[PDB]
Structure 1
Amino acid sequence: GAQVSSQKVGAHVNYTTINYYKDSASNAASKLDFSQDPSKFTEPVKDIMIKTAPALN
């Protein structure tokens, strides 16, 4: 049942988690999720725009 995961590094290891409760709502924080896709907000265009090319041709 024990999960061993990497800690966030400090000034200068791993840590252990066991879930004690039958509901996932009881669990501690979700693990770090570094997912991102800024383009859905910063570049939501139909036709691909190549930076080095003219935006309008």
Structure 2
Amino acid sequence: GAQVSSQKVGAHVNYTTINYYKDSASNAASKLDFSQDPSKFTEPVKDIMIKTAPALN
């Protein structure tokens, strides 16, 4: 049950993971999660604000 995944690039390929333990808590770090939605903090407004339009009309 080997997972083959992309490595993080260095100066100049893939790596293999096998989980040895029956508990997911034993696993190495979660894979890179690039998810983001800054707008829930930077723009949590009820009515859409178009950048090119006046903020207050």
Q: State the TM bucket, normalised to the shorter chain.
A: over 0.9
1:40, 1:29 → 2: CA distance? Answer: 26
Query: In the TM superposition, what is the alpha-carbon distance from 1:31 to its structure 2 partner?
Result: 0.1
Sequence identity percentage: 100
Query: In the TM superposition, what is the alpha-carbon distance from 1:19 to its structure 2 partner?
Result: 0.0
Deviation per CA, 1:2-54: give whole Å up to 9, x if none. 00000000000000000000000000000000000000000000000000000
Aligned length: 57
Task: State the partner residue of 1:32.
Answer: 32
Q: What is the TM-score of this pair, normalised by structure 1?
A: 1.00
Q: What is the TM-score of this pair, normalised by structure 2?
A: 1.00
1:52, 1:9 → 2: CA distance? Answer: 38
* Root-mean-square deviation (Å): 0.1
Task: State the partner residue of 1:47.
Answer: 47
Q: Secondary structure at the match of 1:19?
A: coil
